[PDB]
């Protein structure tokens, strides 16, 4: 049995900082059982995070031994960021069952017949009610502050699923997926639409497949990503209670206390009834308890292909599911057009459209109760097998992924192509059959005319059956254009996004409810293309000169009015819509036509507003090292100097290993401990040996045992030699061992600045196609991209001066309102940006938007400070490219990226120097000629091997191009020696810093004419 | 075999030739020449074959269907052509030389490489043994020229050292013996190490800056500034035509390829670029 | 390819700007650099080598100086900004023509200390003229564009 | 017994549709190959809308395809979306290292992939771009532009297959054909070359793409690990056919470079009933099933 | 601290006088868990000898026997025609690598002299008789591994998986 965590989960309240050591069980519940502690929440608790062992068992769960009257919480990452609690408090318990009425307005107003749905209820509100509480996130432990007290709270409850698993005889998981060509699946489009429909079918389809793990097991089940700020969780448990029964005045406190901090836009899930970012990765992963329900009651089996088979059938459930929604809605449109030829296609080729266009990898090991109890209790080295068992799951993944299976090698195509028994509507086919445009890979199903009459040609062939439909085909399928069964189904998924709730809502609904829901209401989505993004300025600019220079274009509906409701995602659409210029015409036929283009141009010339440029900027974000900084190497760190592959013989970098965790761990203790664990550090080289120092230095314990007495033996006999032999597991095989903890607090923090991503990218005129926050893809306007980028990585670590959505923005944490939230500082981050043309195939944009970040992560090394000598760092690239070009920006410079509050400023500051030059250049002060000129003076100041005579060179060279003859731009110095490693690669990258930056803006300027 | 006889012929660049290719801003030219897999200017079979077929439509309309269904017929597409040509490998690109302290003061020679002369062996060995394209004495030459592959060579053996297109200083030497000329030019052939010559060669490409000029005030117009490249007039490039059996391919090698001296290759033929002469190495050498 | 040179360029900059006491031999040293690459491509580097060595005052105490920045790099040059300049543009070539083996070093320390094989130095320098003049243009401009951004406008 | 295909110039082998350029492929399929030697085999007499029927009448049974570049030989090897060279020298020790420790695997495959990698050594990707003009006006004929990635040699490149007819390999030898995509060239030449058959190792090296009977796909997928260590697995085409003048065929394929398990030969062997049997058995006539095997040159059949 | 020693799986019965081990420590290398075999070795460059079995070290990549690694030393009658050596723990080829490795362990090896008076031509050839490993678990899997007809349910399993995985080189001579 479970469903009843609401006992461990609370074990601790948060308010914990201000209980011990005075500061003038706790409130364990006013509506629920006392919690239960034999067994269950304490063996998950000494097993779930990373303290429990590190100062101590028994002085952990003495909680004052070695204690702090005050209250600090540092980083998880970064040790070196001491953060305060101030004196602001949660108010007193003359106040306090004020918020306990606040945990009845929406668990009491709802029956609770149903356990899992007052967890899954009070799973995503527990933080953010509290947040209005003004409870300034006190961290896990006082004297060990090396974690939110949350991440400790759903850390333990989240592997009390093990506990439980392990409670009845013996069972526990670890379940992982991973879809398969994701990469891929996403360059498989052509207007901008299909990206964002296959970002958000890639996410969605995985999100189905949980919805199931979320109603059975509850919330918490999962590992990765944390769901404690999703944009998919909340608007599933929104519309999850819309159906069990609310009434609009008695829930809204939790869709809007959500509609803040979630969705900070106007934009919101409850007015487009689809969360608007796909922000779901395509790997999560879970852990699981080995018992089952099929109803009422649970029962465990051994099996090995328990949950396996089951995230496969599910998927595949979940695909059939909106398969059978797209052919009931196709045939509730059958005359509105475009719809009639989805449902055509669905009722010709429907064993096709069985086998979803995208694969997964699901991989599982296991846990007995050997190795984590030895006749009733725990044993040693108990803290030693989640980190044991994760990396068996993520070695099984890493060795499944050396197979690369297509999701097209799935399909019986055989008999199909073998014969002329493949329908085929449009042009038949000459040569039997013809790829799809869109794939290249597929047969096409439809071949829709280039054009020679282009009215009759696309009915003699019968793909349109009227005159009327003509127009209503053409608008969504372009002439020349081939799509396979897959392509038209996410084209179909585009031309209605709302389809998707089949497959978001999870077994919650009926597709045939669902379908009528929204087969009433009439609202026009929107999605912006390529065309629609190198138009911006254009826009933006139409809206200020509103009539000034609209006379010839009155009458071309570009001046006209919004029609009634046309919103979307797009941030930037739906604060500008209404101002009087439409949006939702397509640039393709106004300026970016080839006919209409002359005339629209010399309407602008005697208006004298800039041309448009036909040119976005598709920006991808890549993370450096992120799944073993989850799985506990230090890369992430040393990114450049230690690697993947320097953990076969990690013993073989002890110097530069040692080095940083020496001052990782004494560093995020607090109080005496600092004092207590910073001599049984580096006790092998000591003139003192392992095991040997164990009462060496047991004064400082032995000394503190007689300070407070209430724990019946004072006897130590283990308690210094299990704490010096796990710190010589961690160092000796030097890794940071990994706890349920860490990874939540790290997916926390993941989700966190997803979030802020989001509203950064909005706060430009981006278009997020897609948002992991540890990744992203978008499409922004090429003249917003470095700010973008320096604001990116910065954010991404926490740094900036703006209230961002609603939260603060601290140096390595976010503050939301008065609570410091951890962040990624230590965290390298890649970047890539294309300038694409709008008329570029997006196959290849999105390729090699992909490859060039993926094979630029690897090839590029730059000298890097390192103590004063200078290593070869491998990632942190900011990588620039144009029709022919190629730029790389280093982002860090340093290594590891911080270890002070100062180090924040130094992050992203050659780009910042990019924009200083932008800036200078086109204000009329410096010539553009500085980037022509630049070549005479290259290689002189690449040869230059000394700071001072390089300072004289680039100064002359900016002086001998200068407008104004009083320019003072001074180009820092340590930007003058970093060179740039590119071995074994086909492109031509400059191997020195300046060459860069010049090329940089080069590139940049070169998609603006 | 259907492929039954080849005819190699030279290419000579009567006027400077621009065959362009993808135009793009990473190469400071902004109409580069067609490069060819080292950075060398090479012709593409395509260009070659369009270029001659319509010369050759043009000159002899009356052969109209020999030349349709040897060299491809376009309004049929249901044959394949019984013709193919070889890209052109660049054989030879004229260099400036002074000379230093020699006998015979020359002001231009022939400049190569071994690469490609590697190149013009694999095509001439690949055609060797079709019976009738014999042709020993060249790849002979070849033969004995890419023994001493290294060194820069001199054919002509009186240079020792020269100053190549103003800016590389290289010290040349014999070849043992006087290996009669491999053209009947009065010009010297350096055969030059690939690293040495591969500067040489790109010096010896003539790149021009053009403009546009509005016609009333005698300005330039706005954006009307870009960059070319041209192949140097007497730069000699190296191309094959095979030819598969058919009789009116028989017919086509016997009266249209004799009386085809001159052609017109590549772009900007109002510049006067792209005159170019056809040498056949069946009659010459 | 010319891309060592300017490697040599900088540090034989390096060697005649701190040799040049004096700021004015200094701005002199400037001129010098832009004007005599010019006339060396346009006259020739014989007509140009002969009006250097004119201008340069190649008394034994001067060339005992330049043979000391050949090796000591503590040495000075003295001797009227005008003549000055010329030596340290002489010293330039010079220095180009040593690290480049056109010219051994040996037979030029010997050429700078006695007096029968000047001659002979200019002699030789003579018969290597056509190869000195292709080969020393980058490293010149080098020099041009060093002395130009290094050494302040008079 | 021995035929080297020595492109004499660059090559165009075009893979997953037209729709920036048209990508080639690095080895030619078996499909090309046969087609080919057919071409070259052919009479006018024996036609029949079974392509490869009329293929394996003209031919006999065909061995993959490898790089001969001076004397060494470069061989394919995936690790899924990353093709590479790699001389057999490297392919020795890999079993070991498949199953090797997690850090040491992703440390040596990578070395092999990046720096062992011989391809960009030999492999140039040279995009071409041709128009067509209109033989009145003399400028580009409205919607002619073309775009195609051919695959140029750096250096001196091989083609090397084995054919057990020796009969063929008479009026083989000297014979320039029209190997590949538009209108390209190159020559065959015949050797006799010694090389072992039908060796039973556990880990094979798939120099052709091992195709799938598309009755198994479900079976043969569903558990993947159990037959390739390390490759990719796609749905490819068989090609072109000149008789006919149409695609060919489509089917889920083992593509060549992949690490293939001993196992797979089994399971081939036990999921192919007497029509699709000799269906399959000519498709390995005319080249697809190949296995090389880790410890040496030595090439076996799957069926034959 | 710890060591082992090998044993081999040829076709022929020369396994009964090998070591005088059957635990020595208390865990294994090679496992026993109901799917079969588990940390299973493959060492290549040795060829059986299968009368008075011997492995005689070859020249070869491809010549390859598996074996299994329990803590003992054959007998005390060796030392001078066998090998041993310490290797740092993952110098194994070892099929389903399962526990951790101890980053150290001594292993010696039955060697044979090469022989050089004779020209050998291996040949690999596979496990048959069902009966032969269906025995040599009497023989040694049950005295190097007590576990037998105690804990493996599926008998046949164990023996269908050496039908499959094991398969080995013999000298032929
Ligand atoms: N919903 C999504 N939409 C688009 N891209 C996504 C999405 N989720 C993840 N990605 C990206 O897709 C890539 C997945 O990495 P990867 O592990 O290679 O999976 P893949 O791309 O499918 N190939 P594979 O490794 O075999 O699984 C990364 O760039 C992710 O950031
Ligand atoms: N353990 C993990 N947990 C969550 N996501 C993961 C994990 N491992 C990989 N991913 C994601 O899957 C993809 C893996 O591709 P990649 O990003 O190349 O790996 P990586 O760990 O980030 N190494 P790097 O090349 O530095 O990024 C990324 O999108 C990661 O965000
Ligand atoms: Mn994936
Ligand atoms: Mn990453
Ligand atoms: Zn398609």
């Not at chain 1, 051994?302 to 088979?309: A, H, P, R, T, V």
């Not at chain 1, 084209?491 to 087969?519: F, Q």
């Not at chain 2, 014999?134 to 002509?156: R, V, Y």
């Not at chain 4, 039973?200 to 997928?221: T, V």
Request: aromatic share 10%; glycine share 4%; proline share 3%.
């Amino acid at each position: 049995f479970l469903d009843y965590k609401i006992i461990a989960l609370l074990h601790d309240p948060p308010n914990k900082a201000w209980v011990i050591t005075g500061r003038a069980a706790k409130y364990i519940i006013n509506q629920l059982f006392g919690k239960n502690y034999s067994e269950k929440v304490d063996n998950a608790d000494k097993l779930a995070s990373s303290i429990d062992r590190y100062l101590g068992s028994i002085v952990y769960k003495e909680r004052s031994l070695f204690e702090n009257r005050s209250i600090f919480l540092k980083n998880i990452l970064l040790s070196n960021i001491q953060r305060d609690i101030g004196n602001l408090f949660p108010k007193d318990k003359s106040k306090l069952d004020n918020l306990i009425l606040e945990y009845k307005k929406l668990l009491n107003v709802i029956n609770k017949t149903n356990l899992i749905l007052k967890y899954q209820l009070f799973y995503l509100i527990y933080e953010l009610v509290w947040i209005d509480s003004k409870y300034e996130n006190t961290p896990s432990d006082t004297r060990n502050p090396t974690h939110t007290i949350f991440d400790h709270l759903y850390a333990t409850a989240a592997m009390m699923n093990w506990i439980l698993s392990l409670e009845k005889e013996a069972k526990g998981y670890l379940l992982g997926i991973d879809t398969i060509g994701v990469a891929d699946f996403i360059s498989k489009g052509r207007k901008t639409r299909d990206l964002w429909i296959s970002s958000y079918l890639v996410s969605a389809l995985l999100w189905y497949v949980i919805t199931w793990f979320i109603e059975e097991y509850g919330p918490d089940v999962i590992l990765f990503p944390s769901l404690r700020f999703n944009q998919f969780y909340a608007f599933y448990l929104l519309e999850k209670l819309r159906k069990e029964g609310v009434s609009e005045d008695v829930i809204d406190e939790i869709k809007e206390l959500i509609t803040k901090y979630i969705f900070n836009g106007d934009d919101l899930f409850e007015n487009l009834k689809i969360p608007p970012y796909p922000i779901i990765p395509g790997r999560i992963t879970l852990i699981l308890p080995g018992l089952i329900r099929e109803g009422e009651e649970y029962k465990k089996v051994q099996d090995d292909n328990c949950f396996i088979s089951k995230v496969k059938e599910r998927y595949n459930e979940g695909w059939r599911k909106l398969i059978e929604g797209l052919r009931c809605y196709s045939e509730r449109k059958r005359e509105d057009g475009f719809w009639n030829l989805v449902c055509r296609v669905l009722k010709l080729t429907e064993d096709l459209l069985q086998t979803t266009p995208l694969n997964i990898r699901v991989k599982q090991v296991s846990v007995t109760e050997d190795e984590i109890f030895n006749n009733n209790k725990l044993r040693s080295d108990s803290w030693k097998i989640y980190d044991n068992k994760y990396r068996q799951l993520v070695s099984e993944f890493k060795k499944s992924k050396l197979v690369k299976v297509t999701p097209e090698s799935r399909l019986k195509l055989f008999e199909l192509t073998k014969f002329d028994k493949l329908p085929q509507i449009g042009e038949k086919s000459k040569r039997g059959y013809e790829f799809c445009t869109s794939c290249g890979v597929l047969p096409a199903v439809v071949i829709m005319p280039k054009e020679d009459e282009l009215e009759k040609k696309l009915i003699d062939l019968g793909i349109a059956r009227d005159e009327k439909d003509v127009r209503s085909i053409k608008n969504m399928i372009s002439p020349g254009e081939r799509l396979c069964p897959w392509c038209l189904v996410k084209r179909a998924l585009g031309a209605e996004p709302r389809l998707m709730r089949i497959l978001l809502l999870g077994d919650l609904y009926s597709v045939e409810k669902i379908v009528n829901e929204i087969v009433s209401r009439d609202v026009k989505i929107e999605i912006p293309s390529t065309s629609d993004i190198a138009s911006i300025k254009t826009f933006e600019e139409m809206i200020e000169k509103k009539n000034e220079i609209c006379e010839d274009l009155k009458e071309e509906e570009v001046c006209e009015k919004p029609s009634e409701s046309v919103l979307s995602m797009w941030q930037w659409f739906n604060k500008n819509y209404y101002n009087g210029i439409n949006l939702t015409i397509d640039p393709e036929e106004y300026w970016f036509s080839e006919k209409r283009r002359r005339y629209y141009f010399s309407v602008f010339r005697r208006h004298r507003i800039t041309f448009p440029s036909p040119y976005y900027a598709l920006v991808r974000a890549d993370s450096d090292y992120l799944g073993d900084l989850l799985e506990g190497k230090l890369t992430p760190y040393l990114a450049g100097i230690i690697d993947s592959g320097d953990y076969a013989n990690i013993s073989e970098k002890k110097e530069e290993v040692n080095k940083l965790l020496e001052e990782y761990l004494v560093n995020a203790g607090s109080g005496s401990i600092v004092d207590y664990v910073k001599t049984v550090l580096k006790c092998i080289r000591e003139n003192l040996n392992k095991c040997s120092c164990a009462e060496k230095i047991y004064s400082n314990e032995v000394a503190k045992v007689m300070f407070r007495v209430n724990v019946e033996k004072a006897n130590v006999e283990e308690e210094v030699k299990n704490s010096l032999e796990y710190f010589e597991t961690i160092l000796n095989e030097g890794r940071i061992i990994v706890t349920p903890a860490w990874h939540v607090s790290i997916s926390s923090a993941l989700n966190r600045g997803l979030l802020v991503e989001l509203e950064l990218v909005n706060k430009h005129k981006g278009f997020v196609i897609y948002a992991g926050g540890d990744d992203l893809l978008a499409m922004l306007p090429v003249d917003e991209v470095l700010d973008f980028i320096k604001e990116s990585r910065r954010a991404f670590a926490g740094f900036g001066t703006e209230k961002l959505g609603n939260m603060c923005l601290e140096n390595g944490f976010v503050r939301i309102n008065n609570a410091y939230y951890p962040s990624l500082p230590i965290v390298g981050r890649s970047y890539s940006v294309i300038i694409a043309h709008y008329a570029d195939p997006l196959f290849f944009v999105i390729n090699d938007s992909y490859n060039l970040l993926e094979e630029g992560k690897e090839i590029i090394r730059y000298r890097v400070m390192y103590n004063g000598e200078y290593k070869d760092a491998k990632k942190d690239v900011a990588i620039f490219r144009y029709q022919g070009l190629t730029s790389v920006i280093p982002l860090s410079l340093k290594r590891p990226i911080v270890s002070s509050v100062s180090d924040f400023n130094e992050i992203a500051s050659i780009i910042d120097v990019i924009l200083e030059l932008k800036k200078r250049i086109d204000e009329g002060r410096i010539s553009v000629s500085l980037l022509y000129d630049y070549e005479k003076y290259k290689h002189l100041i690449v040869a230059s091997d000394e700071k001072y005579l390089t300072e004289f060179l680039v100064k002359d060279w900016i002086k001998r191009n200068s407008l104004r003859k009083h320019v003072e731009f001074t180009i820092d110095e340590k930007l003058y020696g970093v060179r740039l490693t590119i071995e074994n690669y086909p492109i031509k990258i400059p191997n020195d810093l300046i060459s860069n930056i010049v090329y940089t803006l080069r590139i940049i300027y070169g998609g603006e004419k | 075999p259907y492929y039954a006889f080849a005819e190699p012929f030279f290419i000579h660049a009567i006027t400077h030739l621009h065959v362009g290719s993808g135009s793009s801003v990473e190469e400071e030219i902004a109409l580069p020449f067609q490069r060819d897999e080292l950075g060398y200017p090479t012709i593409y079979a395509s260009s070659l074959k369009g270029a001659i077929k319509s010369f050759l439509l043009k000159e002899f309309p009356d052969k109209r269907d020999v030349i349709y269904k040897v060299l491809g017929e376009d309004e049929n597409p249901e044959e394949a052509s019984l013709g193919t040509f070889l890209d052109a490998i660049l054989f030879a690109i004229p260099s400036r030389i002074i000379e230093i302290d020699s006998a015979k003061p020359y002001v231009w020679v022939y400049v190569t490489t071994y690469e490609l002369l590697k190149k013009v062996k694999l095509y001439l060995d690949s055609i060797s043994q079709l019976s009738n394209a014999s042709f020993s004495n060249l790849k002979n030459k070849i033969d004995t020229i890419l023994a001493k592959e290294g060194k820069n060579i001199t054919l002509d053996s009186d240079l020792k050292s020269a100053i190549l297109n103003e800016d590389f200083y290289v010290e040349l030497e014999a070849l043992n013996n006087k290996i009669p000329s491999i053209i009947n030019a009065g010009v010297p052939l350096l055969v030059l190490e690939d690293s040495i010559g591969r500067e040489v060669i790109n010096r010896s490409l003539i790149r021009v800056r053009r403009i546009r000029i509005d016609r009333d005030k005698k300005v330039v117009e706005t954006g009307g500034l870009w960059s070319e490249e041209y192949v140097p007039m007497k730069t000699i490039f190296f191309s094959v035509l095979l030819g598969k059996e058919s009789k009116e391919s028989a017919i086509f090698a016997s009266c249209i390829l004799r009386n085809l001296r001159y052609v017109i290759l590549g772009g900007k033929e109002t510049i006067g670029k792209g005159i170019v002469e056809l040498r056949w190495v069946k009659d010459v050498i | 390819l010319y891309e060592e040179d300017y490697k040599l360029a900088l540090e034989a900059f390096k060697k005649v700007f701190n040799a040049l006491t004096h700021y004015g031999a200094k701005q002199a040293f400037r001129s010098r650099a832009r004007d005599l690459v010019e006339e060396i491509y346009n006259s020739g580097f014989i007509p140009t080598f002969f009006y250097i060595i004119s201008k340069a005052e190649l008394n034994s105490d001067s060339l005992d100086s330049l043979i000391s920045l050949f090796s000591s790099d503590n040495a000075i040059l003295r001797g009227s900004d005008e003549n000055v300049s010329y030596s340290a543009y002489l010293f330039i070539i010079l220095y180009y023509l040593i690290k480049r083996g056109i010219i051994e070093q040996k037979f030029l320390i010997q050429a700078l200390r006695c007096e029968k094989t000047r001659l002979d130095l200019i002699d030789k320098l003579y018969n290597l003229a056509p190869i000195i003049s292709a080969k020393i243009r980058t490293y010149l401009l080098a020099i041009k564009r060093l002395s130009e951004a290094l050494i302040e406008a008079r | 017994k021995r035929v080297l295909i020595k492109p004499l110039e660059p090559l165009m082998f075009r893979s997953q549709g037209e729709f920036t350029a048209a990508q080639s492929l690095i080895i030619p399929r078996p499909s090309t190959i046969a087609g080919m030697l057919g071409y070259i085999l052919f009479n006018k007499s024996s036609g029949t809308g079974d392509w490869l029927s009329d293929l394996t009448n003209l031919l006999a049974t065909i061995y993959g395809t490898f790089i001969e570049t001076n004397g060494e030989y470069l061989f394919p090897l995936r690790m899924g979306n990353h093709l590479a060279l790699v001389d057999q020298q490297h392919l020795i020790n890999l079993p070991t290292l498949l199953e090797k420790e997690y850090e040491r695997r992703e440390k040596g495959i990578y070395e092999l992939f990046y720096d062992k990698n011989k391809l960009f050594q030999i492999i140039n990707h040279q995009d071409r771009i041709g128009i067509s003009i209109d033989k009145s006006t003399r400028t580009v004929k409205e919607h002619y532009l073309y775009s195609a990635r051919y695959l140029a040699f750096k250096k001196e490149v091989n083609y090397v297959i084995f054919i057990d007819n020796d009969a063929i390999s008479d009026k083989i030898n000297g014979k320039i054909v029209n190997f590949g995509g538009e209108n390209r060239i190159a020559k065959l030449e015949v050797d006799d070359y010694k090389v072992d058959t039908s060796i039973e190792e556990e880990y094979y090296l798939a120099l052709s793409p091992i195709l799938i009977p598309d009755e198994a796909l479900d079976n043969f997928l569903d558990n993947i690990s159990d037959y390739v260590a390390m490759g990719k697995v796609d749905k490819i085409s068989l090609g072109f056919d000149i008789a006919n003048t149409k695609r060919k065929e489509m089917l889920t394929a083992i593509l060549e470079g992949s690490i293939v398990k001993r196992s797979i030969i089994d399971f081939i062997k036990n999921e192919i009933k007497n029509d699709l049997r000799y269906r399959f058995s000519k498709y390995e006539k005319i080249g697809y099933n190949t296995l090389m095997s880790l410890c040496k040159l030595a090439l076996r059949k799957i069926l034959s | 601290s710890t060591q082992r020693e090998y044993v081999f799986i040829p076709i022929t019965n020369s396994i009964t006088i090998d070591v005088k081990i059957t635990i020595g420590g208390s865990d294994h290398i090679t496992n026993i868990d109901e799917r079969g075999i588990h940390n299973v070795l493959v060492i290549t460059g040795y060829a059986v000898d299968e009368k008075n079995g011997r492995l005689v070290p070859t020249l070869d990549p491809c010549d390859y026997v598996k074996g299994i690694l329990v803590a003992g030393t054959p007998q005390q009658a060796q030392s001078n025609d066998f090998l041993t050596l310490k290797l740092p723990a993952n110098k194994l080829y070892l099929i389903r690598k399962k526990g951790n490795i101890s980053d150290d362990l001594k292993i010696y090896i039955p060697y044979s002299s090469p022989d050089a008076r004779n020209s050998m031509k291996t040949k690999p050839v596979s496990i048959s008789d069902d009966t032969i490993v269906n025995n040599i678990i009497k023989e040694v899997f049950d005295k190097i591994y007590n576990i037998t007809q105690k804990e493996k349910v599926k008998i046949e399993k164990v023996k269908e998986d050496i039908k499959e995985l094991f398969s080995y080189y013999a000298l032929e001579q």
